[PDB]
Amino acid sequence: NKVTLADAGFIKQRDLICAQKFKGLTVLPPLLTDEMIA
Amino acid sequence: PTWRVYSTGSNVFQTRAGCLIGAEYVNNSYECDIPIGAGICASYQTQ
Numbered sequence: 073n074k075v076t077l078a079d080a081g082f083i084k085q086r087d088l089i090c091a092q093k094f095k096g097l098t099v100l101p102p103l104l105t106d107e108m109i110a
Numbered sequence: 111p112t113w114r115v116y117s118t119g120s121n122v123f124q125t126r127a128g129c130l131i132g133a134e135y136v137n138n139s140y141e142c143d144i145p146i147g148a149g150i151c152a153s154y155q156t157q
């Protein structure tokens with residue numbers, strides 16, 4: 073709760089900072105989720 | 111209406127990395143063979 077993530081590679085549905093997807097910048101989610109790192 | 115002109119109609123599974131079209135989602139847990147993302151993996155196993 074002290075590291076604020078930006079995108080985390082999740083699916084996108086007043087405009088947020090994630091409007092870089094429309095210009096071709098897509099963030100991929102990691103293979104190992106946090107439930108597996110835990 | 112779509113730039114990719116091929117057609118793929120099969121079992122649909124929704125992951126947090128995207129939609130997986132072409133693979134069945136079993137309930138077992140095996141070693142990761144082909145990584146996809148967001149936890150799940152893919153493999154070529156018999157039944």
Ligand SMILES: *[C@@H]1O[C@H](CO)[C@@H](O)[C@H](O)[C@H]1NC(C)=O
Pocket residue numbers: 083084
């Ligand atoms: C995807 O579509 C479903 C069906 O309406 C919806 O419930 C869900 O919130 C949407 N987004 C994600 C990230 O699954």
